[PDB]
Amino acid sequence: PVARRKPEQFIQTGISTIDVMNTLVRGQKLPIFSGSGLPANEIAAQIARQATVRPDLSGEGEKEEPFAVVFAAMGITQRELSYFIQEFERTGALSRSVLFLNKADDPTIERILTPRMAL
């Protein structure tokens, strides 16, 4: 905690509620609490495909290096998996993103190991 910095630089995500009212700042943990049939995966893929930081408002410029996605999937059912893979391959993010895929039929103990060897 002495060697942390304040998460401080504004990410816009395109989504108007997240940009205006519940700001996503670079260096933050915020989960998407969803229901059972709600489109959580599409909102996560949308924040994946269009989250950028705007430095002209911030005052620096200084480059645009984009994000590197680490996608840690624990027990998804080839439908949500096919949606994430098709979205990331149409936007071209697979040359910057590692995918720790643990599908649903794969055994139910290595779901412990998956987020640790993703983070």
Report the interface residues with other proteins, using CB under 8 A: 89-92, 94-95
d(C-alpha 79, C-alpha 77), whole Å? 5
Least Cβ distance, residue 29 to other proteins (angstroms): 29
Least Cβ distance, residue 91 to other proteins (angstroms): 8
Task: For residue 25, give the 3-state DSSP assignment.
Answer: strand
Q: Which is nearer to other proteins, 36 or 95 (CB)?
A: 95
Q: Which is nearer to other proteins, 22 or 86 (CB)?
A: 86
Least Cβ distance, residue 85 to other proteins (angstroms): 13
d(C-alpha 45, C-alpha 85), whole Å? 10
Q: Which is nearer to other proteins, 28 or 95 (CB)?
A: 95
CA 87-88-90 angle, to 5 degrees, is 65
CA distances from residue 70 to 12, 56, 73, 117 in whole angstroms, order as listed = 19, 27, 10, 11
Q: Which is nearer to other proteins, 7 or 92 (CB)?
A: 92
Least Cβ distance, residue 25 to other proteins (angstroms): 28
Using only the alpha carbons of the chain, give its radius of gyration.
16
